[PDB]
Design brief:
The structure is a homotetramer.
Chain A (H helix, E strand, L loop, with lengths): L11 E7 L4 E2 L4 E7 L5 E8 L5 E2 L11 E7 L1 H6 L7 E10 L6 E9 L2 E9 L4
Parallel strand pairs in A: 1-8
Antiparallel strand pairs in A: 1-2, 1-5, 3-4, 3-6, 6-7, 8-9
PDB class: transport
Keywords: albumin, transport, retinol-binding, vitamin A, amyloid, thyroid hormone, liver, plasma, cerebrospinal fluid, polyneuropathy, disease mutation, thyroxine, prealbumin
Assembly: tetrameric
Chain lengths: ~130, ~130, ~130, ~130
């Protein structure tokens, strides 16, 4: 649907859960970078998790080209605002998106102070 | 809404993901038991995961009384149909539901052959 | 020797870690069970996790035969001492032991108030 | 001694486990980095995981000072040897080391084609 920037049929979605409260991790900053030609990391998109703990509308299909991306979840300020001191500075996820035709990626993350898991769920663009 | 048996505003929902394929764990058997008065386990409800890897309509609010329940995910036949031999016979989750007023429980599970994580997300009945 | 029910060779070890504090879980109660004839759970061995979070010397090679064992780790109380109300009554791991050999089974567990991940590390013994 | 860059006291250990095979991950490449002045990543230490999946003797107490270190574990290739196409380029763990002490840091990681969980076990040394 929408082309350029925005939501569209969300080709990239992020979900954060809180393993200490058993609730969605609300208002967590997410920073997406893409591997640019000079090998450095260029800012691709950014956003905060909603009440449901999800971040949609990060990019559109026409913008989400092949490449390597890194999803940075700023987990530390999340715990610090909770008064808890955490171990990691953030949690990043690096991958090759789109090198065999367009896909949908759902990057899910379970959080705890001294531990974290990440899972991706990829699907082939359906109606 | 609906009272007795069925879906309603789903007071108990289950979600299974596949950590080896990066996809929803489809058609996995889920068996829910409740701690009956004689301490044994009585069958409460059952179902299979859908295409989205979720199981809804297990019970209604009026039926989901306080108590201890065990959600059995029959992970082994899941992997065996995939030709993979797994380590656990199944994955169960035991908890005390409703001892402080009604809640909604989303039991999520990430699966792998020799490992598995489970997370619950509980919320207070909203509109 | 010591054999019977003690370290010796250790065919089964239990490791419990605390994901909120970033430390091992000391004094968690663990109760191993074996599946009996009339399909019930007969008490096998038990103990408490040490200050390093590992539980050694539960059974031995001569007594540890092929079958279905159940490792139930008592987490609720663990969290309770910590002044934390957890979601689970406990954590259990149901598996078919031995098969083609006594080998070595390590059961790992990572706990959070609302989550637990488990892993079995079955490796070949030589000493 | 050995100090400098070797076991000795081991302020930082790396543990890599394979959740698909139920075994430790042997020969995974791990590269530790330290955050430098001009906020970049200066190579610190590196090596390969042993047959038990642990990587010992990376740095030592005198050389391991307060700061931001980065443990990047090269998983993609690991899975590749296994004839499995993974989702991640690698796994990294970004953390502030030392603070109030050299202590001991254990970085645990559990891998799957589409997932990885990580945990830091920072415990008090006495030997």
């Amino acid at each position: 649907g929408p082309t350029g920037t925005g939501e569209s049929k969300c080709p990239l979605m992020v979900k954060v859960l809180d393993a200490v409260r058993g609730s969605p991790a609300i208002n967590v900053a997410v920073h997406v970078f893409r591997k640019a030609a000079d090998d450095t990391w260029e800012p691709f998109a950014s956003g905060k998790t909603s009440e449901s703990g999800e971040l949609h509308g990060l990019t559109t299909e026409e913008e989400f080209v092949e490449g390597i991306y890194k999803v940075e979840i700023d987990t530390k300020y999340y715990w610090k605002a909770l008064g808890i001191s955490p171990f990691h500075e953030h949690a990043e996820v690096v991958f090759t998106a789109n090198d065999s035709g367009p896909r949908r990626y759902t990057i899910a993350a379970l959080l705890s102070p001294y531990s974290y898991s990440t899972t991706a769920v990829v699907t082939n663009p359906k109606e």
